Amino acid sequence: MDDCSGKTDAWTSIKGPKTGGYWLKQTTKTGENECTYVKGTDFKENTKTATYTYGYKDASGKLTKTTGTAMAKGSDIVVGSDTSTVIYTDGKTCDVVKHGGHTELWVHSSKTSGGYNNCCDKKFTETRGSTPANEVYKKCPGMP
């Protein structure tokens, strides 16, 4: 089955499986920071808010770690002045989001080797249109 439509809940995407974290696998953005990631903690179901720790590979190959508060607002994930809009999430293995004109495919740390929900592949292709995808997960340290 291809249960790929209407799976646009931001809170489901913020939480994921509430363990591990997510790596940015592919993006339409060129010059993206390698090993971009998000890990969620401090999950509050009743306010659909969590802490994000997020970052990417620094000059020494180590990850930056910036914290912020992620709020679910319908299909939008809001971190202060930035927003990502969920196109597809399974809350388990992967997400497709629209982030500042760019299309992003995020994959949970358990599925880095493959086998995440193929709705993500479909919806990523649909969303990005003619803009090529770029690989982001290259020579990465561990998830914080």
Residue 141 · residue 35 · CB < 8 Å: yes
Tokens read off for 7: 């799976």
CB neighbourhood size of 1 (10 A): 4
Resolution in A: 1.0
Cβ atoms of 98 and 8 within 8 Å: the answer is no
Please check whether residue 23 is in contact with residue 106, taking contact to mean a CB–CB distance below 8 angstroms.
Answer: yes
Strands (DSSP E) contained in the chain are 22-27, 37-44, 49-55, 66-73, 76-79, 82-89, 94-99, 102-108, 134-135
- H or E element that contains 14: helix 10-15
> What is the identity of the amino acid at 21?
G
Q: Which residues contact 138 (CB under 8 A, 6 or more apart)?
A: 34, 35
List 77's β-bridge partners, or say none: 72, 84
Q: Which residues, other chains included, contact 129 with Cβ-Cβ below 8 Å and sequence gap of 6+?
A: none
Q: Which long-range contacts (C-beta less than 8 Å, at least 24 apart) are formed by 72-81? A: 72/9, 72/10, 72/11, 72/13, 72/14, 72/48, 73/10, 74/10, 75/8, 75/9, 75/10, 76/10, 77/10, 77/13, 77/14, 79/52
Ordered structural domains, the chain, with CATH: 2-144 (2.40.128.20)
Look up residue 90 and give its two tokens: 């399974």
By what technique were these coordinates determined? X-ray
- The Cα–Cα gap between 71 and 93 comes to 20
